[PDB]
Amino acid sequence: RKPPKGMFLSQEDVEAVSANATAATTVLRQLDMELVSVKRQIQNIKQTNSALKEKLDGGIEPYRLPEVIQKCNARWTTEEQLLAVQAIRKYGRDFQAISDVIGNKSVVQVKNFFVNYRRRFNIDEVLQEWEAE
Amino acid sequence: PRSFLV
Amino acid sequence: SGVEGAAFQSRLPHDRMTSQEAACFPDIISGPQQTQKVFLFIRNRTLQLWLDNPKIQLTFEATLQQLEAPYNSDTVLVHRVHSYLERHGLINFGIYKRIKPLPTKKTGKVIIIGSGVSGLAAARQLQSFGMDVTLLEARDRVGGRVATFRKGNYVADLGAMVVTGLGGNPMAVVSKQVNMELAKIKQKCPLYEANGQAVPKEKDEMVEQEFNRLLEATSYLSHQLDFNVLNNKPVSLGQALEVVIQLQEKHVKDEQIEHWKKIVKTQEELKELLNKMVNLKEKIKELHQQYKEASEVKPPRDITAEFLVKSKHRDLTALCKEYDELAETQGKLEEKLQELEANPPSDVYLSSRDRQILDWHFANLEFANATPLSTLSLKHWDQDDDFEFTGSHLTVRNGYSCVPVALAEGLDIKLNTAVRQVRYTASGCEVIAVNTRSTSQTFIYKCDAVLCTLPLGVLKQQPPAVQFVPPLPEWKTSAVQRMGFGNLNKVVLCFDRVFWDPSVNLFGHVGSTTASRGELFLFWNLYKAPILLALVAGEAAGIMENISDDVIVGRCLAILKGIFGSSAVPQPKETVVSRWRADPWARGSYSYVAAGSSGNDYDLMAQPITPGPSIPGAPQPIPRLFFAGEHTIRNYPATVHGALLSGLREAGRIADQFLGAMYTL
Ligand SMILES: Cc1cc2nc3c(=O)[nH]c(=O)nc-3n(C[C@H](O)[C@H](O)[C@H](O)COP(=O)(O)OP(=O)(O)OC[C@H]3O[C@@H](n4cnc5c(N)ncnc54)[C@H](O)[C@@H]3O)c2cc1C
């Protein structure tokens, strides 16, 4: 029903190797060349990646900004309201980004702000101006 | 034949 | 066992009637199931009796004497059974004490060509049935392909050597009748490479395992895939082995290719990530400078200037978040590449050192079939498998010749008598022979029947060594050409001292090339005296025949020195080298199922020849020309027991023809 273990013999493979007088060595050469072709392609991309790794040397260490551990607040200072209006203009509906720009407002408070100061800060106009970009 | 196989 | 074991020992199913039995007892096998079981018991019990004591004749009287009810109630059934078993050499064959001294006068006359085992076996049977029998032997000795070298205390077989198990072997009976010293063969066979160094148990076991697996693979190719014809030519075993090896070398490459293909896919996936990381570290580098410039506007600042600082701060930490998640991915893929590159698939299928040790295993097979594997039939080379005996193989320690010589006792054997022509006609036969010494001194033999046990190689001779008048029919001659007759040689080395491992019966030698794998590839230590026996097989067998004894013994010592020490191997006192293909009375060693042949050809060979009538319009004549021999027995070819049985077979068929079958009624 099946070949022995560690022995590979498919109907197609037999026909391919016995197709002619030297189809045997032909098939084994095409795979010998395919192996060289793929082996040098490895070293090429290994060389390419080796160069790209040296350009990433140092990491992003001289570019990290320290942690600001500020605590959340309920009161909207005139300053914080103004930061918000500008954050909407630059980020749109991304409530997470806006929350980070302000620093002391939760993602839900940001959403509350959108409804609370809707008419006073013309948030409709501010959002449609954002869509123009 | 196979029989003689050492 | 008991009664059922006797049936097995006689190569018969204990609980079923054979085709031959159906012919002789058609009343029983077509009759009720009850009668059949009575028949079977009678048959089996009679066999047991003969087997339990094979050194005396078993008569009908003695048989009936030791039967129970209702098995001894029907005495004509018992008589029919006994006669049948006696006729076909199942009981009372070989060398036994005869109770009723031979019939006073003989009936019918048979000439038997050749006094090999098959000839001798048949002769004894025909004489047992009271017929005039004369054997014509070209050699100055009996036994033919059972040859035994004897000189001083040295005893070594140049021909047949091994009893291939006693379980169902007729030779088991013969060995109880003749003083045969049967010694078991120890399976272990240490190999030694060209240099003289032993092959480590690591390789030894894992090359042999591959060999056995390569064979099973060819069987799969043959039966399951039906790979049996290639460009009209029938596929050989050698062809199929090459095809299998190639496909195994192919798979090795297929594995390697898709392994490195796994590497490039990950390596090229890593390439894309590194580009993304470089482009992000570039934008981070820029964004930091912008945030820095924004913080140069010292407080107090208006809200847009404040927003700019806060904005660029958020934007930077967002891009720092991304880069760290990409450095996370980089670490995972970078070790996933150390994973795949750490465990590569197989480098090669077999090395040059491996392929040489595998060639020894091919040589072994080439010895067993006495032929290059390129000649064996893929489909049928092993067709006689199912009929192999049980038990360990043995060697005849006192020389195999002891058997033919024992069989030759009390028989009219004309030695040095080379049959030149066989003439057979409706009224009878004449055989024309000559004296091998003075070839002009001619003999003529008139007989009712000729039994031809000429070796297949002889029958193959071109131009014919024996002429048939009239010529043998197309169906017979085609069978002769189709069939394979192989070759295998032995080198006998007689020393004054045992320098080999006494507990090791046989040790191999691995040749340098495929072309010379058969050349002195195996050595036998079997005998009482210090004798080493070296085989020449495969393609090497035929070529070593054109080389002188000195050179052959040379290469033998060379090898043995390399294994045991260049000073531990003395000069051989006596040496013999067989040349079976050269031998005109053999023209080879034994038969093999050649590509384009089958087991059915062996049957064709056993089929007798019936001449045309003298007067046209006269009744269909009696069969006159009969064939026995190793090449006629489909289920036991190329062996002694096979020959033995073929002889018994024809003797039965001949006696049935000329003395009549009294047991069929
Ligand atoms: C090297 C070797 C090793 C073997 N080892 C084994 C083994 O281990 N086990 C095993 O079971 N079998 C073995 N065999 C096979 C076995 O020996 C034979 O199958 C068997 O002996 C053949 O018997 P036969 O009667 O059919 O042929 P033969 O024994 O050859 O009988 C035929 C006879 O006819 C004679 N003859 C030929 N031409 C003429 C003529 N023109 N006129 C008159 N007579 C003629 C021959 O001289 C010969 O005596 C081996 C064979 C060889 C060659």
Side-chain angles (χ1 to χ4, degrees), chain C residues 15-17 27-40:
Chain C
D15 57 351
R16 198 177 68 262
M17 282 185 69
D27 56 297
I28 292 158
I29 203 176
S30 65
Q33 291 289 333
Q34 174 54 41
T35 323
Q36 291 181 23
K37 295 190 182 185
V38 184
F39 166 82
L40 289 166

mmCIF file of all heavy atoms in Angstrom, chain C residues 15-17 27-40:
data_model
loop_
_atom_site.group_PDB
_atom_site.id
_atom_site.type_symbol
_atom_site.label_atom_id
_atom_site.label_comp_id
_atom_site.label_asym_id
_atom_site.label_seq_id
_atom_site.Cartn_x
_atom_site.Cartn_y
_atom_site.Cartn_z
ATOM 1 N N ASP C 15 -4.399 -30.056 5.934
ATOM 2 C CA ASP C 15 -5.856 -30.053 6.013
ATOM 3 C C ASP C 15 -6.536 -29.747 4.678
ATOM 4 O O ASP C 15 -7.683 -29.291 4.646
ATOM 5 C CB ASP C 15 -6.315 -29.059 7.089
ATOM 6 C CG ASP C 15 -5.805 -27.638 6.845
ATOM 7 O OD1 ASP C 15 -4.951 -27.431 5.951
ATOM 8 O OD2 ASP C 15 -6.263 -26.724 7.562
ATOM 9 N N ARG C 16 -5.823 -30.002 3.585
ATOM 10 C CA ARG C 16 -6.345 -29.760 2.242
ATOM 11 C C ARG C 16 -5.693 -30.702 1.231
ATOM 12 O O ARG C 16 -4.512 -31.044 1.358
ATOM 13 C CB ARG C 16 -6.117 -28.300 1.842
ATOM 14 C CG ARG C 16 -6.972 -27.802 0.685
ATOM 15 C CD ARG C 16 -6.729 -26.324 0.395
ATOM 16 N NE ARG C 16 -5.390 -26.065 -0.143
ATOM 17 C CZ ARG C 16 -4.347 -25.648 0.573
ATOM 18 N NH1 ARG C 16 -4.463 -25.429 1.879
ATOM 19 N NH2 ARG C 16 -3.176 -25.450 -0.019
ATOM 20 N N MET C 17 -6.473 -31.127 0.238
ATOM 21 C CA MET C 17 -5.976 -31.997 -0.824
ATOM 22 C C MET C 17 -5.324 -31.177 -1.931
ATOM 23 O O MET C 17 -5.898 -30.186 -2.395
ATOM 24 C CB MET C 17 -7.108 -32.847 -1.399
ATOM 25 C CG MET C 17 -7.500 -34.035 -0.536
ATOM 26 S SD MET C 17 -8.741 -35.100 -1.300
ATOM 27 C CE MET C 17 -7.819 -35.838 -2.649
ATOM 28 N N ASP C 27 -12.345 -39.217 -7.108
ATOM 29 C CA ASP C 27 -13.534 -39.733 -6.431
ATOM 30 C C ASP C 27 -13.680 -39.157 -5.026
ATOM 31 O O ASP C 27 -14.793 -38.914 -4.564
ATOM 32 C CB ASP C 27 -13.497 -41.263 -6.369
ATOM 33 C CG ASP C 27 -12.241 -41.792 -5.694
ATOM 34 O OD1 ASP C 27 -11.134 -41.560 -6.223
ATOM 35 O OD2 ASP C 27 -12.359 -42.442 -4.633
ATOM 36 N N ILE C 28 -12.549 -38.935 -4.361
ATOM 37 C CA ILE C 28 -12.536 -38.451 -2.982
ATOM 38 C C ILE C 28 -12.758 -36.939 -2.886
ATOM 39 O O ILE C 28 -13.668 -36.487 -2.184
ATOM 40 C CB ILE C 28 -11.236 -38.862 -2.263
ATOM 41 C CG1 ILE C 28 -11.217 -40.376 -2.068
ATOM 42 C CG2 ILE C 28 -11.098 -38.144 -0.925
ATOM 43 C CD1 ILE C 28 -9.832 -40.940 -1.884
ATOM 44 N N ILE C 29 -11.932 -36.172 -3.595
ATOM 45 C CA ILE C 29 -11.982 -34.710 -3.541
ATOM 46 C C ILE C 29 -13.314 -34.140 -4.046
ATOM 47 O O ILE C 29 -13.729 -33.063 -3.623
ATOM 48 C CB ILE C 29 -10.777 -34.061 -4.271
ATOM 49 C CG1 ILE C 29 -10.540 -32.643 -3.737
ATOM 50 C CG2 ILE C 29 -10.954 -34.100 -5.789
ATOM 51 C CD1 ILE C 29 -9.325 -31.942 -4.303
ATOM 52 N N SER C 30 -13.979 -34.868 -4.942
ATOM 53 C CA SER C 30 -15.296 -34.468 -5.430
ATOM 54 C C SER C 30 -16.392 -34.996 -4.514
ATOM 55 O O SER C 30 -17.536 -34.539 -4.572
ATOM 56 C CB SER C 30 -15.523 -34.982 -6.848
ATOM 57 O OG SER C 30 -15.549 -36.397 -6.863
ATOM 58 N N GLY C 31 -16.029 -35.963 -3.672
ATOM 59 C CA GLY C 31 -16.967 -36.601 -2.755
ATOM 60 C C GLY C 31 -17.225 -35.807 -1.486
ATOM 61 O O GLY C 31 -16.880 -34.625 -1.410
ATOM 62 N N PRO C 32 -17.841 -36.456 -0.480
ATOM 63 C CA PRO C 32 -18.197 -35.802 0.784
ATOM 64 C C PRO C 32 -16.990 -35.434 1.655
ATOM 65 O O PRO C 32 -15.985 -36.159 1.675
ATOM 66 C CB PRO C 32 -19.075 -36.843 1.487
ATOM 67 C CG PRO C 32 -18.683 -38.150 0.889
ATOM 68 C CD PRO C 32 -18.294 -37.860 -0.528
ATOM 69 N N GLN C 33 -17.119 -34.316 2.370
ATOM 70 C CA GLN C 33 -16.056 -33.752 3.213
ATOM 71 C C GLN C 33 -15.488 -34.729 4.239
ATOM 72 O O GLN C 33 -14.312 -34.639 4.605
ATOM 73 C CB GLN C 33 -16.553 -32.490 3.927
ATOM 74 C CG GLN C 33 -16.803 -31.297 3.012
ATOM 75 C CD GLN C 33 -15.526 -30.680 2.465
ATOM 76 O OE1 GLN C 33 -14.462 -30.760 3.086
ATOM 77 N NE2 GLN C 33 -15.627 -30.054 1.296
ATOM 78 N N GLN C 34 -16.332 -35.647 4.703
ATOM 79 C CA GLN C 34 -15.930 -36.656 5.677
ATOM 80 C C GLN C 34 -14.834 -37.567 5.121
ATOM 81 O O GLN C 34 -13.827 -37.806 5.789
ATOM 82 C CB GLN C 34 -17.149 -37.469 6.151
ATOM 83 C CG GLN C 34 -16.840 -38.658 7.059
ATOM 84 C CD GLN C 34 -16.008 -38.298 8.283
ATOM 85 O OE1 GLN C 34 -16.225 -37.267 8.923
ATOM 86 N NE2 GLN C 34 -15.052 -39.157 8.617
ATOM 87 N N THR C 35 -15.031 -38.049 3.894
ATOM 88 C CA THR C 35 -14.080 -38.949 3.240
ATOM 89 C C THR C 35 -12.722 -38.275 3.052
ATOM 90 O O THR C 35 -11.678 -38.888 3.294
ATOM 91 C CB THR C 35 -14.598 -39.436 1.870
ATOM 92 O OG1 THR C 35 -16.012 -39.655 1.934
ATOM 93 C CG2 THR C 35 -13.905 -40.735 1.459
ATOM 94 N N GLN C 36 -12.755 -37.010 2.630
ATOM 95 C CA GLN C 36 -11.545 -36.215 2.405
ATOM 96 C C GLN C 36 -10.647 -36.160 3.636
ATOM 97 O O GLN C 36 -9.429 -36.329 3.531
ATOM 98 C CB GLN C 36 -11.908 -34.804 1.944
ATOM 99 C CG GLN C 36 -12.516 -34.764 0.551
ATOM 100 C CD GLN C 36 -12.862 -33.362 0.089
ATOM 101 O OE1 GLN C 36 -12.301 -32.377 0.569
ATOM 102 N NE2 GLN C 36 -13.789 -33.267 -0.857
ATOM 103 N N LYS C 37 -11.259 -35.943 4.800
ATOM 104 C CA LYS C 37 -10.535 -35.892 6.070
ATOM 105 C C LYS C 37 -9.942 -37.250 6.457
ATOM 106 O O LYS C 37 -8.887 -37.315 7.094
ATOM 107 C CB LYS C 37 -11.430 -35.344 7.185
ATOM 108 C CG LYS C 37 -11.850 -33.896 6.971
ATOM 109 C CD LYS C 37 -12.531 -33.307 8.197
ATOM 110 C CE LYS C 37 -12.990 -31.881 7.931
ATOM 111 N NZ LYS C 37 -13.563 -31.236 9.145
ATOM 112 N N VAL C 38 -10.623 -38.327 6.066
ATOM 113 C CA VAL C 38 -10.101 -39.677 6.266
ATOM 114 C C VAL C 38 -8.876 -39.857 5.374
ATOM 115 O O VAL C 38 -7.822 -40.303 5.838
ATOM 116 C CB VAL C 38 -11.155 -40.772 5.970
ATOM 117 C CG1 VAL C 38 -10.599 -42.156 6.277
ATOM 118 C CG2 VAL C 38 -12.424 -40.533 6.773
ATOM 119 N N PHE C 39 -9.023 -39.483 4.100
ATOM 120 C CA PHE C 39 -7.926 -39.522 3.135
ATOM 121 C C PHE C 39 -6.718 -38.757 3.662
ATOM 122 O O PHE C 39 -5.610 -39.298 3.737
ATOM 123 C CB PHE C 39 -8.368 -38.950 1.778
ATOM 124 C CG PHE C 39 -7.224 -38.646 0.848
ATOM 125 C CD1 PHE C 39 -6.647 -39.651 0.079
ATOM 126 C CD2 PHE C 39 -6.712 -37.355 0.750
ATOM 127 C CE1 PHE C 39 -5.585 -39.376 -0.771
ATOM 128 C CE2 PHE C 39 -5.647 -37.075 -0.094
ATOM 129 C CZ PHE C 39 -5.086 -38.087 -0.858
ATOM 130 N N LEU C 40 -6.953 -37.500 4.036
ATOM 131 C CA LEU C 40 -5.897 -36.613 4.506
ATOM 132 C C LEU C 40 -5.141 -37.216 5.683
ATOM 133 O O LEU C 40 -3.909 -37.183 5.705
ATOM 134 C CB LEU C 40 -6.450 -35.222 4.841
ATOM 135 C CG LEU C 40 -6.886 -34.363 3.647
ATOM 136 C CD1 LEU C 40 -7.729 -33.178 4.089
ATOM 137 C CD2 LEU C 40 -5.691 -33.887 2.839
#
